[PDB]
Symmetry: C3
């Protein structure tokens, strides 16, 4: 099928709630990085990047969950990007496609 | 039309000048990460990521190259990656409307 | 031809071996970052005094390499061979399309830009 990477750049204090909400909905595989982005308004400030690769059919749901749980109503809540992924491979089994996501 | 992610891996001492040049040209939304590349083998680099309208890619690339170059090996590389969707977290706005920074 | 980004999220203790193997096969241009990950099931379970506690996010390393499409299979083989342990949490590889590669110094593009 089609696989997509959902990248969200959010406030660092929102990581725990967002990751919990994602986990509760069955999205447990995620990668988390520390990054910097512009402040609201000159130094950049800390943000968190969450990356999740999912089935294309799950993108809307993932985006809804992230938006609901990451938002505060103030400028600087962040942005989400969807990027095509053409191949996914599990390291330990060399499995590919959606199989590589599960277990 | 479409959106693209422009990723540049550059020298850490070039971050300020690049960021200022991009800002002056109206590109204020960028994400910065501390990474390592070549090259004790791996040395510190900075990854800049900006998602822009397709029409702005050439201009962004020009600005980054102009301001990040030194003429020595290790100046870095720029990748352009397709972005199929952009969503503003607070408002749930999408596409070009989501790209405006406030 | 086309360029592809190979991203691998692996165990931090596998970075040196993977990087060496990649280098020996001619892939020297790579970017490495420190990230945190969690896998599908459980999360790691450690013990304090008599009881267990869970650490959800644990340190991983992200390697990113942009290569000619023709080299993807080989990159993936090398990473898997050298990053695997047989235990859950070995990691994942994603292949992402790259539409343009530009060398900052020269503004060369394409295969010219990957040659280091
Ligand atoms: N769907 C996903 N999206 C993004 N990153 C993921 C995803 N699933 C797993 N990862 C990353 O890969 C690492 C290993 O995942 P895990 O499922 O534990 O590996 P394995 O497939 O070997 O069991 C995690 O620590 C995380 O960084």
């Amino acid at each position: 099928g089609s696989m997509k990477k959902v990248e969200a750049i959010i406030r660092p204090e929102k990581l725990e709630i967002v990751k919990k909400a994602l986990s509760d909905a069955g999205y447990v595989g995620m990668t988390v990085s520390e990054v910097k982005g512009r402040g609201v308004q000159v130094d950049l400030i800390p943000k968190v990047k969450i990356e999740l690769v999912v089935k294309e059919e799950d993108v809307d749901n993932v985006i809804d969950i992230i938006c609901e749980n990451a938002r505060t109503g103030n400028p600087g809540d962040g942005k989400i990007f969807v990027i095509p992924v053409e191949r996914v491979v599990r390291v330990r089994t060399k499995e590919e496609g959606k199989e590589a996501l599960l277990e």
